[PDB]
């Protein structure tokens, strides 16, 4: 089964700067004490980056739960500014429907799951949180022809609807080259209400996944919350998308 959202407001797509944000290791070669000049898909400095929100404003009954199908370019830069682990992961593919294989990468509350299958996706792929704890996964209805799976070691997230401004900045770069999805990441403690903070970031290689799939599009998987297992509420989080461009 799937969750549903009634009367989203559409994404406002405000734009912010990737100020030196989002550098990553371009190749697997170990280098030490050297200056390396290289042509690769990088996010240019001070590039425009588009903001997407999950937000709830009951005083206007305004909901935002911005999970559009975004293009995947020559790879993407992705950053979540976060306080309640609303951003749980991503769906990668082409059609993002059962006619093609898609890769789902999600922090399911106790395990990172990676699967490649002919998923039937929900219209709003999401997790749910009841009473501050994991409820149910509304990401996909059918798995069909799975051909890759990975599951990370056990953990627990904090899943409560923590109050205040954002405290976690999680950064990612995704590249799909020679049938590997490369994932790079960094984490930074933050204490800000809006936008990306300015600053230099280098993202470490986290994953090479031998997913032979065509990745053309992606979208984010997010939580909704409730105290009473119904009337699911959006909760304040923002994510930022930038596109890698061939640059030296």
């Amino acid at each position: 089964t799937c969750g549903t959202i009634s009367n989203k407001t559409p994404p406002n797509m405000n734009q912010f700067s990737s100020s030196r944000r989002g550098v990553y290791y371009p190749d697997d070669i170990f280098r030490s004490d050297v200056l390396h000049l290289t042509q690769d898909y990088f996010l240019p400095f001070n590039s425009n980056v588009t903001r997407y929100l999950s937000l709830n404003a009951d005083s206007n009954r305004i909901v935002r739960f911005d999970n559009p199908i975004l293009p995947f370019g020559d790879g993407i830069y992705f950053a979540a500014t976060e306080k309640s682990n609303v951003i749980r992961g991503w769906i990668f593919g082409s059609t993002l429907d059962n006619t093609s294989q898609s890769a789902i990468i999600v922090n399911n509350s106790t395990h990172i799951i990676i699967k490649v299958c002919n998923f039937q996706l929900c219209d709003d792929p999401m997790f749910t949180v009841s009473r501050g704890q994991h409820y149910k996964t509304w990401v996909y209805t059918n798995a069909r022809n799975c051909t890759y799976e990975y599951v990370s070691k056990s953990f627990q997230l904090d899943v409560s609807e923590k109050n205040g401004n954002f405290k976690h900045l999680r950064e990612f770069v995704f590249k799909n080259v020679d049938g590997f999805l490369h994932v790079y990441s960094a984490y930074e403690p933050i204490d800000l209400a809006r936008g990306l903070p300015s600053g230099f970031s280098v993202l470490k290689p986290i994953l090479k996944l031998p997913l032979g799939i065509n990745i053309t599009s992606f979208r984010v998987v997010m939580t909704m919350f409730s105290p009473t297992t119904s009337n699911w509420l959006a909760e304040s989080a923002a994510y930022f998308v930038g596109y890698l461009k061939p640059t030296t």
Binding site: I29, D33, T99, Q101, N118, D178, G179, G212, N214
Partner: protein, 149 residues
């Protein structure tokens, strides 16, 4: 599709006796595959299949007979060895000019202990000339300096 930067081996052999049956290949696509891309789509938008069929029988002409193919793709990074050839390991011989072979990294030079801090994954070190000046001994995990003979 193989990449242009491919490193690896392509291996094939005839199996027309074993692999009788029906097997499929994509005869047409709107765009070529990327290297190591896969496309499992059977039906088109209307429902007719996009895949052609090999009819494999031992009775078909040789050119049409089934071959199995294995493609091995390799990497030789500055990272721990994961697959190795059957070579037996010798003792170390330090402070002498010797040939050496560490994880298939051949060379010649003088081996000594070293003060080098390596990274947890790192197997060898190089100076600004790419002269390999240190190597992790895969047996003891100790770091050896390599000097010119």
């Amino acid at each position: 599709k193989l990449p242009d930067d491919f490193t690896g081996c392509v291996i094939a052999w005839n199996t027309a006796k074993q692999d009788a049956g029906n097997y499929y290949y994509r005869s047409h696509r709107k765009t070529k595959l990327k290297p190591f891309e896969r496309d499992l789509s059977n039906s088109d938008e209307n429902g007719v299949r996009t895949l052609s069929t090999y009819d494999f029988n031992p009775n078909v002409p040789i050119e049409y007979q089934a071959t199995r193919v294995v493609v091995l793709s390799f990497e030789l990074l500055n990272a721990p060895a994961t697959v190795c050839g059957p070579k037996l390991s010798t003792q170390l011989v330090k402070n002498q000019c010797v040939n050496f072979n560490f994880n298939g990294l051949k060379g010649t030079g003088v081996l000594t202990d070293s003060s080098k801090r390596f990274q947890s994954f790192q197997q060898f070190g190089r100076d600004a000339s790419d002269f390999t000046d240190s190597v992790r001994d895969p047996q003891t995990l100790e770091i050896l300096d390599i000097s010119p003979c």
